[PDB]
Design a protein around this ligand. Structure first.
Ligand SMILES: *[C@@H]1O[C@H](CO)[C@@H](O[C@@H]2O[C@H](CO)[C@@H](O)[C@H](O)[C@H]2NC(C)=O)[C@H](O)[C@H]1NC(C)=O
Lengths: 194, 123, 107
């Protein structure tokens, strides 16, 4: 009864970062050794758990949150960081326990002429809470004047699309990001490896 | 120093392209929208065209669509207007306007106005 | 939208009340138009936004009113520094055209 990591790290499609897709993992044996030694990941930055001794320790729930971001903002995915992604699309708590994996997917998601199917949020009234998911696509009000959902001055669509095309460098190349939050609670903690 | 710094007066040859520069200072440039305005010496102001810096959305004039490209750069927090195929009539002042915009909210109008750039195009 | 300003030139003495009118070809929301002030020599400055609201730092003598297809700004007591040119600009429907200009000269 292995944990279904293949369905997470090999999904055909990945949700946009503003609507990052969350999968709960519980009641399974997780072979984190394969994930750790796969050697196909650009970054494996883990906090609060040794990336070598992660197999031994078993937290109750495993939240695998997946999305896609451009490479230069991958550093933004970390506790205490700031930026457009860390303040409007997806933020991690300061005391976040768990690990993050990010690998290039330019040969997979980029399309000739520009893959414009991936969105991200630029505008919000207030910054996100930890693990906060804001998926409302309402018009944004920059001023104090209500404009009733009509595009114009101080009315901006909060979502912008990524221009993912194969001619882009590393900075603009898409990178698939999977963050594993290791949730500990007053529970039997039925999730560890071999 | 909330400033819209602009390049000094330019003397450009006809048929060339000039990059009119708009450097923002002391105000967050992610949320703000920048409009560009034009003024021939002694004439009125014609609205060059406006962009939203955060999302890159642009909108040009009905008569300047074919030689004007207004783009933004968050790395330096600047706005560039590319004026291609310059000609004699182009000698004018170019102004950058933008509402006072904080991290989340903006003013309901164009208040800040840069020093303006003189451009002279002739042989 | 075409914008017109009237009168073309405002021959007036300092100290009295002057009215500037702006006509929009169609009904334009009041909240999305402003008038600016330009003295030849520097950039035009914002005076009124939303067609009825006082901007920051401006003297209270300037004021704005009217609605729909007619917009008005009145200056209660005219000062020699007020003697400049005034422009309209709506920014509801693209293009955000400016007014032709409303110059005032001392009689
Ligand atoms: C995602 O799929 C790839 C192949 O499509 C997996 O890579 C293979 O993994 C198996 C067992 O894990 C190995 O026996 C193969 O040699 C691998 N082939 C290649 C080309 O790498 C990959 O393991 C999958 N991801 C996860 C997390 O299981």
């Amino acid at each position: 009864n292995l944990c279904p990591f293949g369905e997470v790290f090999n999904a055909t499609r990945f949700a946009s970062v503003y609507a990052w897709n969350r999968k709960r993992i519980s009641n399974c044996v997780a072979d984190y050794s394969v994930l750790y030694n796969s050697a196909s990941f650009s970054t494996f930055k883990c906090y609060g758990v040794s990336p070598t001794k992660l197999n031994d320790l078993c937290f109750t729930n495993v939240y695998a949150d997946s999305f896609v971001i451009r490479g230069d903002e991958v550093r933004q995915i970390a506790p205490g960081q700031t930026g457009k992604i860390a303040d409007y699309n997806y933020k991690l708590p300061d005391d976040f326990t768990g690990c993050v994996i990010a690998w290039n997917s330019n040969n997979l998601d980029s399309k000739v002429g520009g893959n414009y199917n991936y969105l991200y949020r630029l505008f919000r009234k207030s910054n996100l809470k930890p693990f906060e998911r804001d998926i409302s696509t309402e018009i944004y009000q920059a001023g104090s004047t209500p404009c009733n959902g009509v595009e114009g001055f101080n009315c901006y669509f909060p979502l912008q699309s990524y221009g993912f095309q194969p001619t882009n460098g590393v900075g603009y190349q898409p990178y698939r990001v999977v963050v594993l939050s290791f949730e500990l609670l007053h529970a039997p903690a039925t999730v560890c490896g071999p | 120093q909330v400033q819209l710094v602009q390049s000094g007066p330019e003397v450009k040859k006809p048929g060339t392209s000039v990059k009119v520069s708009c450097k923002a200072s002391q105000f967050t440039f992610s949320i703000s929208a920048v409009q560009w305005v034009r003024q021939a010496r002694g004439q009125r102001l014609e609205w060059m065209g406006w962009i939203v810096v955060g999302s890159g959305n642009t909108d040009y004039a009905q008569r300047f669509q074919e030689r004007v490209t207004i783009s933004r750069d968050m790395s330096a927090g600047t706005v560039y207007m590319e004026l291609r195929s310059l000609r004699s009539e182009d000698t004018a002042v170019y102004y950058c306007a933008a509402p006072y915009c904080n991290k989340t909210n903006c003013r309901d109008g164009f208040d800040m106005w840069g020093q303006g750039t003189m451009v002279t195009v002739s042989s | 939208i075409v914008l017109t300003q009237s009168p073309g030139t405002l021959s007036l003495s300092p100290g009295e009340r002057a009215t500037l009118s702006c006509r929009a070809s169609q009904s334009v929301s009041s909240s999305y138009l402003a008038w600016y002030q330009q003295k030849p020599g520097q950039a035009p400055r914002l005076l009124i936004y939303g067609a009825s609201r006082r901007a920051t730092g401006i003297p209270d003598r300037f004021s704005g009113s009217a609605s729909g297809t007619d917009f008005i700004l009145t200056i209660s007591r005219l000062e020699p520094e007020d003697f400049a040119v005034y422009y309209c600009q709506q920014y509801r429907n693209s293009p955000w055209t400016f007014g032709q200009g409303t110059k005032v000269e001392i009689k």
